[PDB]
Amino acid sequence: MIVPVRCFSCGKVVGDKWESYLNLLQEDELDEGTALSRLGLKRYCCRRMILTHVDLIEKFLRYN
């Protein structure tokens, strides 16, 4: 619904990386993988975390 706080598998915090990831795509124009590696998410477990999140709360917030 939100970025999960950690990688389910290794525990690395990853919930402090969502705004940055999305800034790193739209503002500085990197491809999704270069971006993830810049935030230091280098095992495929953590990468899967950000790369496959879906921010559904951004839809939930349109209701009144």
Partner 1 sequence: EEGPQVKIREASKDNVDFILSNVDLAMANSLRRVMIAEIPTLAIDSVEVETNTTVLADEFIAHRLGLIPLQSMDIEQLEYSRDCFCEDHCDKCSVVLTLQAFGESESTTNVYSKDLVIVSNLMGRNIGHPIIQDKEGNGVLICKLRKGQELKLTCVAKKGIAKEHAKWGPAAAIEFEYDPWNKLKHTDYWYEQDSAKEWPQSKNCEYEDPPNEGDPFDYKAQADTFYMNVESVGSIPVDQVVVRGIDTLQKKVASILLALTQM
List residues near partner 1 by CB under 8 A.
1-3, 5-7, 10-13, 15-20, 43, 57-58, 60-61, 63
Q: Which residues on adjacent β-strands are paired with residue 6?
A: 13
Q: Which is nearer to Zn ion, 12 or 38 (CB)?
A: 12
Helix or strand run (H / E) with residue 24: helix 18-26
Q: Which is nearer to partner 1, 28 or 58 (CB)?
A: 58
Q: Is 46 labelled a binding residue? A: yes
Q: Is 51 labelled a binding residue? A: no
Hunting for tokens 């495929």 — which residue is that?
Answer: 44
Residue 43 DSSP label: S
